[PDB]
Design a protein around this motif. Sequence first.
Motif, PDB file in Angstrom:
ATOM      1  N   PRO A 259       0.842  -1.200   0.000  1.00  0.00           N
ATOM      2  CA  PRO A 259       0.000   0.000   0.000  1.00  0.00           C
ATOM      3  C   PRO A 259       0.872   1.244   0.000  1.00  0.00           C
ATOM      4  O   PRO A 259       1.920   1.283   0.645  1.00  0.00           O
ATOM      5  N   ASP A 260       0.437   2.258  -0.741  1.00  0.00           N
ATOM      6  CA  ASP A 260       1.180   3.504  -0.931  1.00  0.00           C
ATOM      7  C   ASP A 260       2.530   3.281  -1.607  1.00  0.00           C
ATOM      8  O   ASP A 260       3.475   4.051  -1.404  1.00  0.00           O
TER       9      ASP A 260
ATOM     10  N   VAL B 118      -7.805  -2.638  -5.858  1.00  0.00           N
ATOM     11  CA  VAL B 118      -6.660  -2.613  -6.760  1.00  0.00           C
ATOM     12  C   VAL B 118      -7.030  -1.743  -7.947  1.00  0.00           C
ATOM     13  O   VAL B 118      -8.104  -1.910  -8.539  1.00  0.00           O
ATOM     14  N   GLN B 119      -6.153  -0.807  -8.289  1.00  0.00           N
ATOM     15  CA  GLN B 119      -6.492   0.241  -9.232  1.00  0.00           C
ATOM     16  C   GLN B 119      -5.417   0.345 -10.301  1.00  0.00           C
ATOM     17  O   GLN B 119      -4.232   0.106 -10.047  1.00  0.00           O
ATOM     18  N   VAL B 120      -5.851   0.706 -11.503  1.00  0.00           N
ATOM     19  CA  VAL B 120      -4.961   1.024 -12.610  1.00  0.00           C
ATOM     20  C   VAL B 120      -5.255   2.453 -13.044  1.00  0.00           C
ATOM     21  O   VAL B 120      -6.415   2.878 -13.077  1.00  0.00           O
ATOM     22  N   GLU B 121      -4.202   3.196 -13.356  1.00  0.00           N
ATOM     23  CA  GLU B 121      -4.303   4.625 -13.638  1.00  0.00           C
ATOM     24  C   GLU B 121      -4.057   4.859 -15.125  1.00  0.00           C
ATOM     25  O   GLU B 121      -2.911   4.859 -15.587  1.00  0.00           O
ATOM     26  N   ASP B 122      -5.142   5.069 -15.865  1.00  0.00           N
ATOM     27  CA  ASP B 122      -5.086   5.351 -17.294  1.00  0.00           C
ATOM     28  C   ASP B 122      -6.430   5.917 -17.747  1.00  0.00           C
ATOM     29  O   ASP B 122      -7.147   5.302 -18.538  1.00  0.00           O
TER      30      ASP B 122
ATOM     31  N   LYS C 223      -1.992   0.522  -8.178  1.00  0.00           N
ATOM     32  CA  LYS C 223      -1.967   0.961  -6.790  1.00  0.00           C
ATOM     33  C   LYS C 223      -3.160   0.379  -6.044  1.00  0.00           C
ATOM     34  O   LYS C 223      -4.177   0.010  -6.640  1.00  0.00           O
ATOM     35  N   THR C 224      -3.000   0.280  -4.726  1.00  0.00           N
ATOM     36  CA  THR C 224      -4.049  -0.069  -3.778  1.00  0.00           C
ATOM     37  C   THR C 224      -4.566   1.197  -3.102  1.00  0.00           C
ATOM     38  O   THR C 224      -3.856   2.204  -3.006  1.00  0.00           O
ATOM     39  N   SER C 225      -5.817   1.149  -2.646  1.00  0.00           N
ATOM     40  CA  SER C 225      -6.400   2.345  -2.047  1.00  0.00           C
ATOM     41  C   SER C 225      -7.159   2.105  -0.746  1.00  0.00           C
ATOM     42  O   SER C 225      -7.272   3.010   0.086  1.00  0.00           O
TER      43      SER C 225
END
Lengths: 94, 91, 92, 94, 95
Positions: A9-10, A41-45, A77-79
Motif C-alpha cells: 500500500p502507498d 486494486v487500481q490502474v491509472e489510465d 496501486k491499492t487504495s
Amino acid sequence: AFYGKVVKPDETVVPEVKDYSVIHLSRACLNNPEHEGKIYVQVEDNGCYNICCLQKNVCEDTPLDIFLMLDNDVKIKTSGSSNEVHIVGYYEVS
Amino acid sequence: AFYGKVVKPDETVVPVKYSVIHLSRACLNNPEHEGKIYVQVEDNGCYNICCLQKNVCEDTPLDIFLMLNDVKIKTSGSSNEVHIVGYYEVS
Amino acid sequence: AFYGKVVKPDETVVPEVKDSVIHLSRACLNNPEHGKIYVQVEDNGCYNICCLQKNVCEDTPLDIFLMLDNDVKIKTSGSSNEVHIVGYYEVS
Amino acid sequence: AFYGKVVKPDETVVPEVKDGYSVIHLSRACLNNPEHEGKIYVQVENGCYNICCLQKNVCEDTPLDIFLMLDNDVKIKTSGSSNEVHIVGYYEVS
Amino acid sequence: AFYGKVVKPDETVVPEVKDGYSVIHLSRACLNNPEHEGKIYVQVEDNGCYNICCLQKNVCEDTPLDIFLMLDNDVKIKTSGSSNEVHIVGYYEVS
C-alpha cells in the motif's frame, strides 16, 4: 513468462518490461493481512479505475482478466485498507 | 495430458513431462484444521495464488500458467492438504 | 489497449471508439454508500450482465464482447451507486 | 460434440469414448434440488483428486476447466452427501 | 457478435444460428428484479437435460458462465424451478 509483484500500500507499481509489450493479470490475493477493511486494486489510465475489491477474510482472493499496455506507462496501486496484494499473471506480446 | 498432485502442508512441489503447465483448481479434502491456508508459487519470489479456509472457501478455480523455470508450489497456513489439478501444454 | 469507464447512475454510456470491438473484463463498486444494482447492455433488447450490491458482492469478473459500430448501450439500474467498468479494446 | 452426465452418488463414471475424439473437457458442475445438506466432492482418478466441492444452499454449482484423456480410461465420481451432480462439457481432439 | 436472451420460465429456447459462426459461448446468467423466492436452475437439453447453474433471489442473483454450445447440435435451454426469468448473455464464435 511468469509475472508476479507484491503491491505494498502507498507504493505505486509501474510494471517492469521484460522483453513483452503487454502484461496480463490472472490473480490477485492478500497475504495474512492485518487490516480488516476493504482494499481496491487500481490502474491509472486518463483516469484511475478499480479492477477488484478484497476485504480480508470475507474475500481474500479473486481471479483477474486485465490486459495492461506497458508502453502506455500504466500504473497499479491499492487504495483501501493498508494491506499488501499479490499480483500474478504472465507476459504477452501485442 | 492430465496434471494432479496433492500438496501436503510440509511439502514443496516442483512439477517435466510439454513446456508449460496450467493450473485449473486448488481444493481441500475433508480438512481437519480450521485456519486459512494459502497456495503459493515461487518463480524469484513467493506469490500467493489463492486462499482456502475450512467452511469459508474450500476450493477455487484457477487460471495460472507456469513454465516448467523450475517453479515450485507450496502451501502456507493450516495443516491441511491441497489438491492441485490442471493440464500440461506446449508453448 | 486498456478501457475504463465509471458509469454514474442515470448516465447511459455508449463506449468511446478508439481507432472496433470492446471486451468487458470487470464491473466493480467503489466505497458505495446506498440495495442491488444491475449492469445492463441495450443491444433491440436489454440484458442484465451482472448484479452488484454494497455488502454481499462489490465486484465480479466479466467476459462480454460488444460491437462499437452497433451502438450498444450501457446503463445501471437499481440502487444509485457508481460502477467501474474495466476491460480492453480489440479489432475485428 | 456435447457432453453431459448425471453423476449419481457412489457410482463411478468413465465417460463414453466417441470414436475420433481423444480428450474430454469438463466445463460445469451443478447440483439438482439436493436432499442431504452435507458437502460433496467431485473426483477424478495415478491418484484420485478433488476437482470441486459443492454443497446444498451454500454453493450448488461451479465452473470447471478439466481436460481428461479418454484413452487413459480416467474415472469420475462424487464422494460426500448422497446427492447427484450434473457434469457438462464437450468432446475434443488433441 | 453479442448474444442475449431472457428465458421466461415457461419457455424452451433454441439459440438463433447466425451463419458464419458455428459455436455460441455463454458468459452470464443473471436474474432481473425477481419476485419468487425459490431457487431456479438453468438447464440445457440433449439425450438428457442437464443443470448448468443455480440462481436464487436473496442468496445468489447472478453467476458467470463459460459454456460452449455447438449450433450444429440445435441444443435447447430452459429454466426449471421458481417462476423467474433469467437473462443469458454471451457472444458468437467460429470453430
